[model samples]
Target: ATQRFLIEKFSQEQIGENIVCRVICTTGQIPIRDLSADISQVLKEKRSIKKVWTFGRNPACDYHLGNISRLSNKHFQILLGEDGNLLLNDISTNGTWLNGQKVEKNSNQLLSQGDEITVGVGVESDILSLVIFINDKFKQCLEQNKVDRIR
Candidate 1:
């Protein structure tokens, strides 16, 4: 059976059915450092990260990532469908990044499990939530160069 994952704040729901993941960046304070998080230590050296979430039947996967917490700037969640399709939602203050570019607010994207998410940057890319899908996928954020600067 095909499954769907939804992420949001509040609501009394069950994972067995469909649940929302919440993150409080202020109180929760997601710890990220050196392009990685505490979870990095436990994960294999591959560019991908795996987490069992209450979204869908498939486990949550993060790419080019480190340590992460749900209660973040906003609420960033990862969902995988039965077809192995990847999706991400970010209600974060900074915003969820796809391949290094900030995703449109409240926008949900159907990715290929090889996309990258960039949270923040600066000083070891502090608080940056970046993920490398499967096999070093999404090498960089948007082929458009930041140096080019938006006209």
Candidate 2:
């Protein structure tokens, strides 16, 4: 199960420096961080940071969901894609819901601003929900790079 999700990649661009990937936990606990600093550390080691910012019940995941039986060790992940799009990868057994749609396991879903992410199959009491927020600077940067810009 884990091996399939392992086949992921990090953003090739220096997105950590220019983009903002902020996550708000509306119904659960997860450790958030300064993504820029986290990316810098990952880049310093020259290793793929794809798994670093993952959300799960294991300590290894950047956003640790504790010992939630409804969650996987590597439940999901949010990162900047090579094309400058925010991506959400769901790798859980219970399943992840994005805007009321079930995100296929081992699949990458494009995340837009204000997207609501639910970490569970249904509207259970133990489920976790999150709201993703990327700064408007991302769009500006994307447009500027055509010639030449999160929270």
Candidate 3:
């Protein structure tokens, strides 16, 4: 994905061009559309998501080991903290939920392992889970996985 798209998608939450992550995680270029990591493939197959979109940069946003937690169109309700807690956050125009209960959104909710997130509409079925994580520790996760770095 291009850096411009990341600028568009995450500009509100981020500033400058330091690569705060418009989620440029991808798997491959031609076959995988220049994806950043192998983990995007897992989301596609596991949650029935077709594509994990990205921008800004690559590999930096790619999935890696030691990732504190993940949220997706498939599992969009999970919110994980550096302390290792899990909370479910949803309540959007399109909902991210578990079972039928709507998750709380626009908030910071602790999360845990195995927490499920059900996205709204067919978006749930179309794209990969949008994983949430601690911005600081994301670097550590990247190192642990031995994944390549954009920088």
Candidate 4:
């Protein structure tokens, strides 16, 4: 698995990225493409280095996407905080929900481990939903694994 392989072999410093937001199509039209990327490789190199990420149906947007018809072109964003925790920012014209609560638009909400987000409110199945997880301690473990392998 890419997750296992990358975590076992690469330190966060090596990846140049600290967190990953995974998109799972809990109920919706699955993406035509495998939507994944290296945060640092794709994000760190950009001129806009505020370290915040925007995700939406817009092809010009950053990170993964939503394919449901009710979904807005400009959706939510993931912001990296000073403590290395992530915040979810809602900017969708329709609505973005976290744990079933309608997220306040333009506000930053702390994303806890295993948070479920719905892109469009009140839409039935074929609804666009995503779950994101962060690896807070794996960086240290991966660094040790790298050294052990070399030894």
Candidate 5:
């Protein structure tokens, strides 16, 4: 239950946001530092999000991605579904590619561990590369509680 416990503190700001994913900007980019978010807590909240989260260059976006011209003002989104699975939805003029495959706009695709997501891909342009992560102990927690695979 530690993984579940850890995420709870985020609401109280007991610790910094619980990072669930990181994005590495393409090579030779200034601010070579990576981008990450508190998605672990986002997902663990366990309630349906009222709206799709906007991630793009506009300050209005839930996740602001400044100066990325290629990215739409309101690009991709992360949807927490009723079944408790995370889904990535692409809604951009350019495109959101997952593991090199372009995601169709308006479709909610389930997210899995280590999924490589690239937004606004191009021949040589520096795109945002993201990697998804989950706590190792979380899986162990799942294993203990799950009785069997439905299938």
Candidate 6:
């Protein structure tokens, strides 16, 4: 059997490259690729800095949402604010949604923990949905026997 734990006080500082937060997919097609390079690595490797983390169907995006028909090449972006808040920018033609509200294209909205983000909105099939989880805490799990006995 498996057990789940909500590890608290994980903190934002635990994550390097100044990552504001992390996301977990809740619905739609799962991404088979790993996360893209951070701003520091991108600048080190490419010699330029584009601080925003991009998400889309394009293979070149920081986070690829799969080659779904309804998704755009560059769907949206998550920008790290100076104050450590995460901002969402909708750049897709189809549309991006935040907690059931459609965010206007080319505009930005502040993101919070437990915020539901939906891409490819209006497309019932192949839409991607994710929830925002901040760096303060995260989920972890261990076997029951492992906790029953001390090492």
Q: Which one is best on TM-score? A: 2
Best model number under lDDT: 2
Q: Judging by lDDT, tell me the better candidate of 2 and 6.
A: 2
Better of 4 and 6 by TM-score: 6
* Tens digits of lDDT, candidate 4, 9-123: 6664342243444455566454522222334443334442235667778887775574656677778777653233456788888888887778789888876776777877755
> How should the candidates be ordered by lDDT, best one leading?
2, 6, 4, 5, 1, 3
Ordered from best to worst TM-score, the candidate numbers read: 2, 6, 4, 5, 1, 3
The RMSD of every model to the true structure, in order and in angstroms, is 18.3, 13.0, 16.1, 8.3, 8.7, 11.6
Writing each residue's lDDT as its tens digit, candidate 5 over 34-109 gives: 2223434444555655235667777776666667777788777765433333567887778888877888887788
lDDT of 2 by residue, 26-62 (tens): 7747654433222333233443333225788878876
Whole-model lDDT, candidate 2? 0.64
lDDT of 3: 0.33
**Model 1 / residue 75 / CA error / Å:** 3.9
Q: Write the per-residue lDDT of candidate 6 for residues 39-112, one digit (tens) a residue.
A: 33322343222357778878787777777667788888776533334567888879888877888887778767
lDDT of 3 at 85: 24
Model 6, residue 110: C-alpha shift (Å):
1.0
> Candidate 4: global Cα-lDDT?
0.60
The candidate 4 region of ten consecutive residues with least summed lDDT is: 142-151
In order of appearance, the predictions have TM-scores of 0.36, 0.66, 0.28, 0.62, 0.58, 0.63
lDDT of each: 0.37, 0.64, 0.33, 0.60, 0.59, 0.61
Better by lDDT, candidate 6 or 4: 6
